[PDB]
Design an enzyme around this catalytic site. Structure first.
Site, PDB file in Angstrom:
ATOM      1  N   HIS A  41       0.808  -1.216   0.000  1.00 45.79           N
ATOM      2  CA  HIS A  41       0.000   0.000   0.000  1.00 45.79           C
ATOM      3  C   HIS A  41       0.843   1.268   0.000  1.00 45.79           C
ATOM      4  CE1 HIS A  41       0.523   1.161   4.257  1.00 45.79           C
ATOM      5  NE2 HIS A  41       0.286  -0.091   4.606  1.00 45.79           N
ATOM      6  N   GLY A 143       3.124   6.026  10.343  1.00 44.14           N
ATOM      7  CA  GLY A 143       4.480   5.906   9.855  1.00 44.14           C
ATOM      8  C   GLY A 143       5.184   4.625  10.243  1.00 44.14           C
ATOM      9  N   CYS A 145       4.164   1.537   9.458  1.00 46.45           N
ATOM     10  CA  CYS A 145       3.948   0.432   8.529  1.00 46.45           C
ATOM     11  C   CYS A 145       5.290  -0.036   7.983  1.00 46.45           C
ATOM     12  CB  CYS A 145       3.028   0.851   7.382  1.00 46.45           C
ATOM     13  SG  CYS A 145       1.372   1.381   7.891  1.00 46.45           S
TER      14      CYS A 145
HETATM   15  C1  LIG Z   1      -9.326  -0.886   9.518  1.00 51.86           C
HETATM   16  C2  LIG Z   1      -9.379  -0.137   8.138  1.00 51.86           C
HETATM   17  O1  LIG Z   1      -9.984  -1.051   7.179  1.00 51.86           O
HETATM   18  C3  LIG Z   1      -7.972   0.211   7.645  1.00 51.86           C
HETATM   19  O2  LIG Z   1      -7.162   0.634   8.386  1.00 51.86           O
HETATM   20  N1  LIG Z   1      -7.643   0.008   6.264  1.00 51.86           N
HETATM   21  C4  LIG Z   1      -6.303   0.309   5.796  1.00 51.86           C
HETATM   22  C5  LIG Z   1      -5.506  -0.764   5.478  1.00 51.86           C
HETATM   23  C6  LIG Z   1      -4.201  -0.557   5.025  1.00 51.86           C
HETATM   24 CL1  LIG Z   1      -3.179  -2.008   4.612  1.00 51.86          CL
HETATM   25  C7  LIG Z   1      -3.691   0.718   4.897  1.00 51.86           C
HETATM   26  C8  LIG Z   1      -4.501   1.813   5.218  1.00 51.86           C
HETATM   27 CL2  LIG Z   1      -3.831   3.426   5.043  1.00 51.86          CL
HETATM   28  C9  LIG Z   1      -5.812   1.616   5.674  1.00 51.86           C
END
Ligand SMILES: C[C@H](O)C(=O)Nc1cc(Cl)cc(Cl)c1
Ligand SMILES: C[C@H](O)C(=O)Nc1cc(Cl)cc(Cl)c1
Ligand code: NA
Ligand code: NA
Lengths: 301, 301
Positions: A41, A143, A145
């Protein structure tokens, strides 16, 4: 003596943390040999998160769209591929600090250390367990991740988790290092909630054995239980079912203390019934479930 | 989100631990530049520990009596001297992984990370606080002596603790890196005990702020109090007195949550007098006092 939530020395992992930047998004990557592993992502905007088409977003990217920074040095990305939910960026330099490592996908109840990082620099290390609902109860800010979880049995780092997201209840979801999520989660902004969490019964038992080993017996009793009668009581307190596998895994700790597993199960049943009546067990007023049988044996005498 | 007992990344300190053997006693050393630091009781035999004369026992020793192992490599000792309760061993090789570092002495109530080691090999890291009775609730087994405690400031490792002994209650006692003990302890096998401990009030208040930041708010109420009134309560429940300096230190947290320190003291007063009525705070049924205000700030930013 003493008993502490103990993480693994993080140095072997610190030497692999890098910063990955795509557009305006910056998070952490794991630099092993000539590959940098990070959540896919990284290539999304916030508008993409509702229904991202990752193949479509990635095909529009060149190698030079990915900025990888290891400490001060820029690494040159020379290739990129996607595997499940992780992006794999090929870099021109092999990590000279690469430890002996392997990737391992773990089962609920297993523990591991987390090296929380921001902008590719490590912030702290703490211990975690993979909950029965396939979440983890971590400490992550925006930050983080790409932060990874790992065990270090002997000199080999076994990477088992990389952080992807926080669910609305404040718990955390991620993948193994092959990009497969733990549990039923997706790298997508949808209505996904963790199943109800349960207590890791086998870990509570190991931690009770740990309490005996450090010299505390006040919670034992003269009673025993059948395995099925124990499980019928335990599910009523949202405890996970205890299987014969769990009974086998506890064997060594049973032999060291002289208390058969089902006798320890009788004591846990009474603790659930009575509470602790003002006392503590290894300094805790609650029953602790994030120490595995393996963990107890490593830390205890 | 999330709040965990979090240690500093231990890599910079892992590269400094070595094994030091004098006769049949083997413990851990800290290798910085061309000096290895370790507890001076490495030179004692079991009967020597009953009433050691360290100055005389060290005069009888010479450089070759100290086997120092940096992993697989042997370090050759070219000199030996004593500072307070630590033994300084000059070696022929400077440590190439010597980090930027200082020796500091911490105050009771301050926290630090412990990197437990055995035979010069780091085995685990965890977070500790210097208790008001100058002990620490660690997790150590035989052979852990010479394990170090440290904080990381920016790039600089601040070494604050060296493990020396365990007390009969299972808590632990050690020195700073200049060999000065924390607390009224001596490195001798005699009758020693930890004094009565107290709860670190400023740390509990900081943890209560961490709980509010993480959405745990049920203990807040409409009331406020004065330093004088609260400290009457604090004395009753074996809590350290709260000083005006403590209120100042809690400044950054009182703003971020918009909750005055004396406002929060009213909450703690009520928790102390009435208990928790079956609820938990950040997953704990007791009030945690091993998070400093800084710990809370650094983890929640
Ligand atoms: C819990 C909600 O469904 C969520 O946090 N979705 C999300 C998942 C990823 Cl892997 C990245 C971002 Cl920024 C948002
Ligand atoms: C509490 C008891 O008096 C004790 O632990 N004494 C001791 C001190 C050091 Cl520094 C080393 C060793 Cl082997 C024993
Ligand atoms: Na880095
Ligand atoms: Na109040």
């Amino acid at each position: 003596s003493g008993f502490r939530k103990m993480a693994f020395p993080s140095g072997k992992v610190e030497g692999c943390m890098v910063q990955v930047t795509c557009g305006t998004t910056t998070l952490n990557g794991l630099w092993l040999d000539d590959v940098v592993y990070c959540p896919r992502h990284v290539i999304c905007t916030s508008e993409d998160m509702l229904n991202p088409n990752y193949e479509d977003l990635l095909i529009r990217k060149s190698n030079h769209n990915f900025l990888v920074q290891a400490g001060n040095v820029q690494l040159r990305v020379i290739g990129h591929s996607m595997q499940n939910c992780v992006l794999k960026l090929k870099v021109d330099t092999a990590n000279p600090k690469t430890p002996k490592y392997k990737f391992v996908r773990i089962q609920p109840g297993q523990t591991f250390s987390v090296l929380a990082c921001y902008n590719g620099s490590p912030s702290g290390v703490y211990q975690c367990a993979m909950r029965p609902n396939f979440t983890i109860k971590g400490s992550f800010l925006n930050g983080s991740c790409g932060s990874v979880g790992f065990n270090i049995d002997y000199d080999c780092v076994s990477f088992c988790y990389m952080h992807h997201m926080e669910l609305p209840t404040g718990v955390h979801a991620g993948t193994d290092l092959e990009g497969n999520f733990y549990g039923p989660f997706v790298d997508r902004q949808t209505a996904q909630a963790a199943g109800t969490d349960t207590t890791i019964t086998v870990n509570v038992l190991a931690w009770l054995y740990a309490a005996v080993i450090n010299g505390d017996r006040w919670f034992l009793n003269r009673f025993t239980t059948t395995l099925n009668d124990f499980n019928l009581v335990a599910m009523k307190y949202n405890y996970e079912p205890l299987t014969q596998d769990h009974v086998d895994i506890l064997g060594p700790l049973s032999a060291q203390t002289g208390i058969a597993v089902l006798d320890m199960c009788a004591s846990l049943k009474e603790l659930l019934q009575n509470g602790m009546n003002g006392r503590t067990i290894l300094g805790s007023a609650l029953l602790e479930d994030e120490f595995t049988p393996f963990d107890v044996v490593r830390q205890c005498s």
